[PDB]
């Protein structure tokens, strides 16, 4: 029941409150030691072997630091230690709902296995937090340190997910955990207004440390010049006008990361292969949940006791199996182990403001196969031999400019906020803020099938009006 | 079949020969992605989640770099590209035989489970290298690049392990892979004379990067001033006389690491608990090997096909099990998951150089139990409630001075080596080079049992003529 | 006469040829130990106290590394050790002509003191190299190591400066040092087609290390994928087509640095004050040159012996002086020592494609003073109380896109180069590549004077059809 | 009059109180921008170009951080903001008395130029602090922020230097700035009991950053486990018992630095040459002080107004001079500029516990010359051709063990301290804690002179009962 100290390779030595220590030392939280932060990227970057455990620790520490600084430099906000504990707990448990290989589970697998439900890992995080609190007798411990569980659990849940109860924007306050007087406390762990939060800072630093790519953003300088100001009967976190350029750079940094590591094409195809292996391995793996009931890999998100035992272990559970009824997924994983991967064909961009919707992906391989090239190639390829991948690259707000939703204050008048437009900053800033990319892969790896795949790709690219391949003079001359 | 580039957060961008790529892309080598470098230390240092895969990559790269530099600066040594390839292959496969949690498997488990055999992970590395070469059709590929497999496989094996075939030192050359005039090539990956090799450099850098501690050794400076000289009809690697102090510091660094991370009290007790869980879980886990035969965790080192599937996965295989025959090991692992660990009692050193030998460990708990305090508490304790751990801290040569087996050359006469004694360097250097420590833990966490545990500890420590317990006045007033 | 090793905090240990050591150990080169790399920026960033000596060392080392790698990977280019020595010498002596406080000497002082000559520090570098070679007896030493002085001195000079003796582009080869089949050797130290050279890499790394701003560019990866290909009967350095995005990022990095450190407001005004102090201190400082002749600060660029003694020392020579004729410059420097600096008024951007040319700067303060604001204040400010600074921010080629002059090759056909347009890369790239900024400062430092100065500034900005003052509703409401 | 932020490459962004800003913006403090931290070491390590300005900033910041942490974690000590300001000011102004090239001014020059006075740079720091406070009207500003100048100036002075007023240890409190119940505040900036203070931490970090050698000490961990406890009716700073080994390592680190950078042979001989040049240049340089009086380089420490203008500038003042009376020192500096340095002959250690005292250095070269070697030597060397340098390497307390004066506390009883002996820690620790080294250099640089010099060196070493030369079988066979 004393302050603990833990050493971090990203931050320094970190202090942990006894209640935080109690929360951490449970099976539900310890589950995070066995889930990769970057999923399949570890198969392209050999140094990316870190897990969500240290990421959660860092996010909690940074949330605590930011709230402490805000309270210290401006003591009329009425920030109490109860609020500090609540914010730290919310930051600590914000990723309890990630599945095997993180985003691959909720970005690729669940959509294809159970296409009738809508599910995100934040909902899973809320459910897992409820399960953790109920199964470990934590409410008395919270009451022992001055928390009020009925209000505070709701406050933490609303910190992890949106306002909840669905919105009705007729000039109303949607939240319930805290009054509007402290609305800024909802902008720390996850910022729904412009996307500036400590989670980005933490994973920027940690991913740059582990990948071998050097980071360019400085969050301590941002914390130095941060303030709280009243805007439109709404207290929000504001930066200083002289930091505006830095903010732009931050988003640039994020984009760069997505373009170098998270959307690497070999890593993406490896993730696709793992998803296909899981799809084939389904209907045969059993997980025991509450009441001795059995669950599927796809239905395990309906029971937290069963979901607690679903980690990256399942991967090695399929590779080492001997059951003759799991042979196909085992063959796929073995092919992964030999680097016999699906081969990349080409890439393209839409020209105009036309975009591919989510519910139109399944037909793309059919249209690539259905094309009729002019040149006559010997081999014929079916629509089952093609994989089409769509990538959405934006600044986090669907072609909106995030910096237009930030408030700024001047040195001479620190208690009044303003807005800055893009033309008041620089002429060298980007013009657009969202785009799509399309990659095409072929499953048949014959040196002959690749030529046919390229011919169909170029014909489909030409007739769809989707620009032309970069190397239109090298691979298709 | 072209040079391949890979990015490492320790060494940067690294080039790989196509034969190396063929060797890497096999199940036997890909096994190393699922075994941690530090084992249980990951449960004390949250950033130590790296595996043997990147360590092997780095060791191979550094071996190649050192041999290239030596060849470049001395063109009369007759170093060929065949030798470079062989040395790189040997460095790449040096830790190919580690088991689950690395040194825990061959340091704690095998000795207790099968105490009639003598086994090290280098023998396993040799066996696994043979299995890898035979199971993947590599000999033709080696022949394609100018290697002679019958000589070169023996050379690589002799690089990984000692001279082999038992020694008879009557003025003879024990090795077979290479003649006498290439002997220095046996000092790169593993140095049996004084212990200076690239493996130490690599894990120093990597462990310090991941743990959050900065190292003070520079190996590039050492490579700059390295040379090859003839000593007693033996060609060996020599450093320059001005680097002697640096060499001492290097060993100091190693000791410091062992005293901070590798021999941490909580990490060691966690490793002990995991070993106990594996001991109880044995006789119930089955692994399929060649011919459809079944193997135990302890007997899996007798078949390489079965050994290929034995990784850290087994840990999570026991925790998630439902078989009633595995309840005890599962209970122990669950205890670990709650931080309900065995409690540390005390520590001591032998003063009179009466080093406790290996075959006296099992009786130590009896001696701690079988000891009558003067004061009476009436709580009692069986000998089954005590854990005694013996730690050997040395400079790698069992109380010998390693720097006495190093050769040095001067600037004016670069082609003649000399020796330097400890009194020609400094008076502030260590006077001994080996020591022992003894730690005691109790398996009952009652606030009452802890007091009796330390009463027996102090009585037995006083009895055995050892030192008095440090800071004893506080815990034993 | 043996290879020398030197330790660098940016790179590692660096090897130096005996001829390089002879060149370094001369007064002309040792002069660089007393000129700062960033000039007045040291008065805003306390860690920027490095000089040009280490920068020159690093540039030479990197030039050698790049040429060595290019020769190693393509034996048909016929790169000899003579070329390596010549390139290293050119990289080592590329900044011999910098004056006190580096860019402010040839960017601010010489233009204002002697506005009838056109002078850059590269011409000074060539003259100083000639002086160094002639006054130290280096030609026989060059002949001792296989160099041919008559051709090689011209080659080095043409490496430091352009083709020389003016061009006539009627399909001719302008250079003389080397034939047309080694033209790529002219693209290493200073690149004229685009701005990709080792000098940028070196000062990026060093300035990021010293300022406390972290770097984002990786030049080793660039060296890994570099190649030489024939383009339009020109042998040129081409990059790998998958690195195009990285190249864009590089220029972004450069811009960021200019926006954060090199064009800081307070640093620029401090440089302006130092330039004014030097202007007033002239007519009174005497420097002895060849033949016992005396020279001025402004006329010292006409004699290299006199120029050798002109370093940052002159600064402290004025501050510690006692002559009554140097009193005004001493007062200005003393005011600098108290942070009684000229106060910043405002900033603005041109709206359209109109730009302020060089020969219109002197009249700008008159225009600002001559403006008639609407509201009336008692205080009247003359044109002598205003300072106007014009900043040009571009990608190094005056609103042209540098990436349009880069050549790329594909993996399948490594011996044929291609071009990539901006629309084949991304839609998030900048639209324009150059812009101007205008800052205004006032010399009178009382509050009424500042209010009046900003009234004139806003009136003039409105009059001349420029953008809004960012704080158009805060400081001017 | 607002908190000011400054960016540091060693620490992060640092906050500065307005009073600190007023103190910094004065000529006396700004003088530190032109004195180098390592003196002549910059001529061996090209990256060591930093000055005392940033070192003072860092020391002040770290003192503030430590006092803040101590006050925060233990609020019964009654630490006020007045104490924080006083401690920060003391840390900020602790090196105001350093002269040109720092330690060589008060370590080599003053002893030889004025052998009748005893002078250290801390006395100069106290005098310069008095001059700064009196010449800039700071007392009213201190009164404006709650300080009491009469007590507080004395407190700061006693922080920079010892107790003052000469000691009489008959159970009395020697200090006067603060009462006996705040005594721990005297252990922060400069620790006279055991030598553990923030100044060591700062220059460890900064010198490691600039030299290119990685640091091994972590001071943040030390601050985490620091506490204040009553020892013998004396409140003192105590560490945690588990950190004892770390403390040893810290001192090891210090020794290593002294053995690598600060006592480098070439750096020391360069410092000796600069000292000789200053000795010859004296009697001819005039500095103006108070009342229009003129002072010498050696007598400038008697007037603070004259001392304010004495920096490294004097170096370049002699090199660029034209007066015929300064010709010898100019020749010496010019010889330095060519690397025509005094040549190193040999090194030796005393065998027994006999040590060379300070007042026997002048006769050492006479003893070396007066030796009569047996072998026949061609040339004869006078005693003016020899230089003998004596180096004392200790742990900072004249062969005493510093760790014997540290107090420790246990987790169970955090309010009562203990002592730990060297045998309770490890058997691998050093046996002795101080030693002496003697280097010999020759001024005549021809080969015959070097051979003769080493013949005399070996004969004298044999005579004086010293350890034989390391390479006694290489250079003198
Ligand atoms: N010398 C060292 N240097 C850096 N980090 C270290 C370290 N030693 C440990 N760590 C890391 C390891 C951990 O991540 C963290 C805590 O290590 P402990 O201070 O050993 N904490 P514990 O609970 O064992 O001692 P107690 O309960 O008696 O107070 O710092
Ligand atoms: N911008 C970047 N910056 C740093 N590292 C990067 C990187 N991009 C990838 N890496 C890492 C990832 C890897 O660890 C390593 C090589 O990845 P690649 O060469 O980019 N991809 P592949 O081998 O398929 O190119 P090829 O067409 O020639 O086959 O560098
Ligand atoms: N332990 C060390 N660690 C890192 N850098 C060091 C160093 N010692 C010196 N340096 C730095 C200092 C220099 O920048 C560079 C050379 O130092 P020297 O090896 O001492 N070269 P010298 O000419 O004195 O010895 P010789 O002529 O007998 O071969 O490395
Ligand atoms: N983007 C940046 N990133 C890192 N450091 C920076 C920086 N910009 C400046 N620094 C460094 C430079 C300095 O060492 C320090 C302060 O820079 P200012 O924030 O510019 N302070 P000032 O007084 O000019 O603005 P005001 O008075 O309006 O508040 O941080
Ligand atoms: Fe997150
Ligand atoms: Fe190893
Ligand atoms: Fe340059
Ligand atoms: Fe200091
Ligand atoms: Mg603990
Ligand atoms: Mg999340
Ligand atoms: Mg988010
Ligand atoms: Mg590839
Ligand atoms: Mg091994
Ligand atoms: Mg070994
Ligand atoms: Mg040397
Ligand atoms: Mg230049
Ligand atoms: Mg340029
Ligand atoms: Mg300011
Ligand atoms: Mg001092
Ligand atoms: Mg001291």
Numbering used by the authors:
A (entry chain B), B (entry chain A), C (entry chain D), D (entry chain C): 113 to 589
Can you quote the paper on this entry?
Sterile alpha motif and HD-domain containing protein 1 (SAMHD1) is a dNTP triphosphohydrolase that catalyses the breakdown of dNTPs to constituent 2′-deoxynucleoside and triphosphate, and is therefore an important regulator of cellular nucleotide homeostasis in mammalian cells. SAMHD1 dNTP triphosphohydrolase catalytic activity requires assembly into homo-tetramers. Sequences at the N- and C-termini of the HD domain stabilise inter-monomer protein-protein interactions and incorporate four pairs of allosteric, AL1 and AL2, nucleotide-binding sites. Nucleotide binding at these sites promote tetramer-assembly and regulate SAMHD1 through combined binding of G-based (AL1) and 2’-deoxynucleoside (AL2) triphosphates.
First, that dNTP hydrolysis occurs within the confines of the D2 symmetrical State-I tetramer where each Dimer-2 pair is in the tense state, substrates are bound at the Fe-Mg bimetallic centre and the phosphate, sugar and base-binding active site residues are engaged with the dNTP. This configuration is observed in both the crystal and our cEM structures of SAMHD1-inhbitor complexes that have the State-I conformation with the attacking nucleophile hydroxyl positioned on the substrate Pα and likely represent the catalytic state prior to adduction and formation of a transition state.
